[PDB]
């Protein structure tokens, strides 16, 4: 049964500040004596956390339902085990599934069911005067739980439950995340001796558990415990005292942090790279110490928002089963060419087929090509001896790379070759595969001459018949099963990738996402990477062009590949920002120069706003003297750190 607690004084909510709290280990790799940058969901430094009490004196048994935005930092200052658990869910009313994490006097219970939670859930500890003892009497959390998918009960323990009188003695920090069906919990416990507020200091949380629950958490609610005795007179809804405890809630955002690992492998310090321009220069220099000077930082920071990849919607597989498993391969002197277009083509399975003697690529990294956009792909398939496969490469010479098949130096393709003794050799000889032996001049890259001109090797006119000094230029390979490796038939397929101004046609595979505007987002259009605000453009280009470039040749107008619109690109914002520091050793005070502001596109106004031809300077006092230059600001203006 559920009881609505009465006799609780209502007070306005309280807020406090997190002093570099809520840092956890991002992965499970040991590192020591290193500065490591990582982008993940963290609690920002010097943030604004909400504060909740359980103080009898007012009652103030706080247990509101709170949002669960992108993960929660939960801190608890206790001395008597009041905070007992949480419930996470969306509606918390048996129409949807909810998660219960509770610590009852004996066990830790984790359940995922359809709960009819009470409006005011709580736990109850009762104290007997006649024999001094505190024992758990009430468990009033939910009415019914029907369809349970995940369950866990820990090994039995006995908890203290005794009411204490001193100040808070235990800090318990938790971080809760919900990603791809996993509810992730990090935690750490710390001894403290204080009375109020969230304390200073640094301590990284370690991975605790990773639950595969698969539900949609949007809200959560804290589960506390009650004290009842002979000094708590009333009915169920009024005869209850509280017991002091406090807890703090903060919300995680995607941030880049610079974490510090000492020589034992523990995170001892961190820098929030998007707190301040000073922190940004710390992040760039990859150090915790900044020397005196002026540093360029970056344009107005909207932070990470969301990442999109946009690719053409074409789901037809490429005929790679027809080039490689072709029934009849063609003589080297008259090779074949097949152009594969409008197709999504996977290469990783081709790479790992592991039936290939030689698989080499030039001008393309072996793994990057799996997700790239080209305008066309060609495939040239023929047959040669094993020894001459070396000549199939840019800048080589011989009877194959001079008169048969010539490659250019700037080659953007991949050479694949595999022995085929079994298929195309037989006893007595396989004399079908001819190759040119005599030619007047070398072959230009990618040119085919399949003529049978009689080679006039000397001075006499040959008249069109062979004999002395008139040689027929095509000579036929002799393949047999008993030959060596050097004389055995290898089939070779040469892939070529070409890119033009035309709209991409070989792109894949990689699933695309939605398109968002008015935020500063990361984007991937047809293999091009960028970070900026994408804006709708009421403009047009000529049909044969896809990208627009400015005077610096960066892309300013990138056409979406699915709907053929034109989308403009503006950096997060448009500003010029510089930072002046006397040295982190000396002080933490800094000045900021905005090079394109006439004094407002500034991070903060403060005071001491001074206008120079170098820009608007904020955080520095202007004096009418004229000293020697200490720190150059520009346009004749210098800065110093004085008394």
């Amino acid at each position: 049964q559920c009881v609505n607690l009465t006799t609780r004084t209502q007070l306005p909510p309280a807020y406090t500040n997190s002093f570099t709290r809520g840092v956890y280990y991002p992965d499970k790799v040991f590192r020591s004596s290193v500065l490591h940058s990582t982008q993940d969901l963290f609690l920002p430094f010097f943030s604004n956390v909400t504060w909740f009490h359980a103080i009898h004196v007012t009652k103030r048994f706080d247990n509101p339902v709170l949002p669960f935005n992108d993960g929660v930092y939960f801190a608890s200052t206790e001395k008597s085990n009041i905070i007992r658990g949480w419930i996470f869910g969306t509606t918390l009313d048996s129409k949807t599934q909810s998660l219960l994490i509770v610590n009852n006097a004996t066990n830790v219970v984790i359940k995922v069911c359809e709960f009819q939670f009470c409006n005011d859930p709580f736990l109850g500890v009762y104290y007997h005067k006649n024999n001094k003892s505190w024992m758990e009497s009430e468990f009033r959390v939910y009415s019914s739980a029907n369809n349970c998918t995940f369950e866990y009960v820990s090994q039995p323990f006995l908890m203290d439950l005794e009411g204490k009188q001193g100040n808070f003695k235990n800090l318990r920090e938790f971080v809760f995340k919900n990603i791809d069906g996993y509810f992730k919990i990090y935690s750490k416990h710390t001894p403290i001796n204080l009375v109020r507020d969230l304390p200073q200091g640094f301590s990284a949380l370690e991975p605790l558990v990773d639950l595969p629950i698969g539900i949609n958490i949007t809200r959560f609610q804290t589960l506390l415990a009650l004290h009842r005795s002979y000094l708590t007179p009333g009915d169920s809804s009024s005869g209850w005292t509280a017991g002091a405890a406090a807890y703090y809630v903060g919300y995680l955002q995607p941030r880049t942090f610079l974490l510090k690992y000492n020589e034992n492998g523990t995170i001892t310090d961190a820098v929030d790279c998007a707190l301040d321009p000073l922190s940004e220069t710390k992040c760039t220099l990859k150090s915790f110490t900044v020397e005196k000077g002026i540093y360029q930082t970056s344009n107005f920071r909207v932070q990470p928002t969301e990442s999109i990849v946009r690719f053409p919607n074409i789901t037809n597989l490429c005929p790679f089963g027809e080039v490689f498993n072709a029934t009849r391969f063609a003589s080297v002197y008259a090779w074949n060419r097949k152009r594969i277009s409008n197709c999504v083509a996977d290469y990783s399975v081709l790479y790992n087929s592991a039936s290939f003697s030689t698989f080499k690529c030039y001008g393309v990294s072996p793994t990057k090509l799996n997700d790239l956009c080209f305008t066309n792909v060609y495939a040239d398939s023929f047959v040669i001896r094993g020894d001459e496969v070396r000549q199939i490469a840019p800048g080589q010479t011989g009877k194959i790379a001079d008169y048969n098949y010539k490659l250019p130096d700037d080659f953007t393709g991949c050479v694949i070759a595999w022995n085929s003794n079994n298929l195309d050799s037989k006893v007595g000889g396989n004399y079908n595969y001819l190759y040119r032996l005599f030619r007047k001049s070398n072959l230009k890259p990618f040119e085919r001459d399949i003529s049978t001109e009689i080679y006039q090797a000397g001075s006499t006119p040959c008249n069109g018949v062979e004999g002395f000094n008139c040689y027929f230029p095509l000579q036929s390979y002799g393949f047999q099963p008993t030959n060596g490796v050097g004389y055995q038939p290898y089939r070779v397929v040469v892939l070529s990738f070409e890119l033009l101004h035309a709209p991409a046609t070989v792109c894949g595979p990689k699933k695309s996402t939605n398109l968002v505007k008015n935020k500063c987002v990361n984007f991937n259009f047809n293999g091009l990477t960028g970070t900026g605000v994408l804006t709708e453009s009421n403009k047009k280009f000529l049909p044969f062009q896809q990208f627009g470039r400015d005077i610096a040749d960066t892309t300013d107008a990138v056409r979406d590949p699915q709907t053929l619109e034109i989308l403009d690109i503006t950096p997060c914002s448009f500003g010029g920002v510089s930072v002046i520091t006397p040295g982190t050793n000396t002080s933490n005070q800094v000045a900021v120069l905005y090079q394109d502001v006439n004094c407002w596109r500034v991070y903060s106004t403060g005071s001491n706003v001074f206008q120079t031809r170098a820009g608007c300077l904020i955080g520095a006092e202007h004096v009418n003297n004229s000293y020697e230059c200490d720190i150059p600001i520009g346009a004749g203006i210098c800065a110093s750190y004085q008394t």
């Binding site: 005599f438 000094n469 000579q475 047999q480 030959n483 060596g484």
Partner: protein, 588 residues
């Protein structure tokens, strides 16, 4: 255009046809050598006929390029090896008379009826083990009086025909045509004459004479005990007592002339029988020795295609140990391997021939051969010389570990090798100086037998037991003389065999005498050897020699160093007996 540029084109067109016709002939020869049945002979003859007619026409074509314009020195060598007229320069009528003479000589030697006893194994077994003075005299005289009597008139026509054929090809005599292999011309500082071979063959034998005189006096003084009163201390050894029909090898004399009889030798047949070596492990051990000295592994097709064990009675095949290089990257070994130390040695010998043929596979078709004729067998022999030392057999599982060696064993070993190595050098030198003298015309036709037995007593120290008049023909009995083969390859093989061994033992940093030096686990020596195996015939043999030993001419000093302990022991043993011989005493 220029003759050199048109010649490089002709040879590019040639090598492609030649490689395929050669492989097509080698496969058809292997098929008959492994399946000695019917119908295979016809394919052997057809594949050996198409090759011969194609090479004859391609050689007629080669002439049209004059050889003075070509200055490359490589195309010079291919065109030299192709433009040789051979025997076709002789008229049509006398070419069939000459080939009839050759056929009759081979037939008259192969089928010799002594009554009825043939040669193998009729007279050979009597001569090699009878140990009776008169039985072996009958078995000697019969052959010298039948097979040598039926070949007398023919060899007189064979001499004049071959002499005119060699005179037509711009040589002086057939002796010069034979001598012309050791000839280098055009490479300044490395030149070699055909008159230079007669020299050096004399200033190297006159340097080995003392060891032979002490080995001769020891063998005679140990042979006086067996045949009691037939040999005289001053006189020479009669010709029928030298342990062979022709007195070519003294090996069969080792059953008598044992220095220290009681001690045995390193016979390891029982060690391999005990551990059940399956007639294939031997070749794996050979492959591992070569892999360890640094050279590349065996090709895969060797293991499947090659025949390494007699197929049984159902399939008969002639199996004289051989290494086959069929071209087109195909190598095979043909041996009826049996579990015996002898086949453990021959496996390393044949494997060294196979390792020599893999080295120069990159060269053109006409330059895929040893630097000169006396290089394949030196390479095949030094590997069987290193794979026999007791240290190596100790490294391998057999030859039980402790086995301390004493000097009394190393003298038995050295003398058993000396009877084989330094006993056949004065016979090779005397035979190949007689044929050069007869071909040049120094010996008139009435002094053929009277001068042979004056060469014998002054060079080999071997008297005849019954005088032979002018009608007889003694040298024509030997297989090489009647079947028209060269013979100076066996005088140079022996010398190269030990200059290679000294240079590679030095490069392995071995310390001590050479008779127990081993080469395994020494990569540097293997690189030194492969730096000369790789050249093939494309470089002059003096340069190929200088890449290994360090000299431009053949020497005898390493051979003498190898036998220094034996030489000292013999120089001490003979002091009671005589040294040298006398030409007067004849048993008759």
């Amino acid at each position: 255009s220029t003759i050199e540029e048109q010649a490089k084109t002709f040879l590019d067109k040639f090598n492609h046809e030649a490689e395929d016709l050669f492989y097509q002939s080698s496969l058809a020869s292997w098929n008959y050598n492994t399946n000695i049945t019917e119908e295979n002979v016809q394919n052997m003859n057809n594949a050996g006929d198409k090759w011969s007619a194609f090479l004859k026409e391609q050689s007629t074509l080669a002439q049209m390029y004059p050889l003075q314009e070509i200055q490359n020195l490589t195309v010079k060598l291919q065109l030299q090896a192709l433009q040789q007229n051979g025997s076709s320069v002789l008229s049509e009528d006398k070419s069939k008379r000459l080939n009839t003479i050759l056929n009759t000589m081979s037939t008259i030697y192969s089928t010799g009826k002594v009554c009825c006893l043939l040669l193998e194994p009729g007279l050979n077994e009597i001569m090699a083990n009878s140990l009776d003075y008169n039985e072996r005299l009958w078995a000697w005289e019969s052959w010298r009086s039948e097979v040598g009597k039926q070949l007398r008139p023919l060899y007189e026509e064979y001499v004049v025909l071959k002499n005119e054929m060699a005179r037509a090809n711009h040589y002086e005599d057939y002796g010069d045509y034979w001598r012309g292999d050791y000839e280098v011309n055009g490479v300044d500082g490395y030149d070699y004459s055909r008159g230079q071979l007669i020299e050096d063959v004399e200033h190297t034998f006159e340097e080995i004479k003392p060891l032979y005189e002490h080995l001769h006096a020891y063998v005679r003084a140990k042979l006086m005990n067996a045949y009691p009163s037939y040999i005289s201390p001053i006189g020479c050894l009669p010709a029928h007592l030298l342990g062979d029909m022709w007195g070519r090898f003294w090996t069969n004399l080792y059953s008598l002339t044992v220095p220290f009889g009681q001690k045995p030798n390193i016979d390891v047949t029982d060690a391999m029988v005990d551990q059940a070596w399956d007639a294939q492990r031997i070749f794996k051990e050979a492959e591992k020795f070569f892999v360890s000295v640094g050279l590349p592994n065996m090709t895969q097709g060797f293991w499947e295609n090659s025949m390494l064990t007699d197929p049984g009675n159902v399939q008969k095949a002639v199996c004289h140990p051989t290494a086959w290089d069929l071209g087109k990257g195909d190598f095979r070994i043909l041996m009826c391997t049996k579990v015996t130390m002898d086949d453990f040695l021959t496996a390393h010998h044949e494997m060294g021939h196979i390792q020599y043929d893999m080295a120069y596979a990159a060269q053109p078709f006409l330059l895929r051969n040893g630097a000169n004729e006396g290089f394949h067998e030196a390479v095949g022999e030094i590997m069987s010389l290193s794979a026999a030392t007791p240290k190596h057999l100790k490294s391998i599982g057999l030859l039980s570990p402790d086995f301390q060696e004493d000097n009394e064993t190393e003298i038995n070993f050295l003398l058993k090798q000396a009877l084989t190595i330094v006993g056949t050098l004065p016979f090779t030198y005397m035979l190949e100086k007689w044929r050069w003298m007869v071909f040049k015309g120094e010996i008139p036709k009435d002094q053929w037998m009277k001068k042979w037995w004056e060469m014998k007593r002054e060079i080999v120290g071997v008297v005849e037991p019954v005088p032979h008049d002018e009608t007889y023909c003694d040298p024509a009995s030997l297989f090489h003389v009647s079947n028209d083969y060269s013979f100076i390859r066996y005088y140079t093989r022996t010398l190269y065999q030990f200059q290679f061994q000294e240079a590679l033992c030095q490069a392995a940093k071995h310390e001590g005498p050479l008779h127990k030096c081993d080469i395994s686990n020494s990569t540097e020596a293997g690189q030194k050897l492969f730096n000369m195996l790789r050249l093939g015939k494309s470089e002059p043999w003096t340069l190929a020699l200088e890449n290994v030993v360090g000299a431009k001419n053949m020497n005898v000093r390493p051979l003498l160093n190898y036998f220094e302990p034996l030489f000292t022991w013999l120089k001490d043993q003979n002091k009671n007996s005589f040294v040298g011989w006398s030409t007067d005493w004849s048993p008759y």
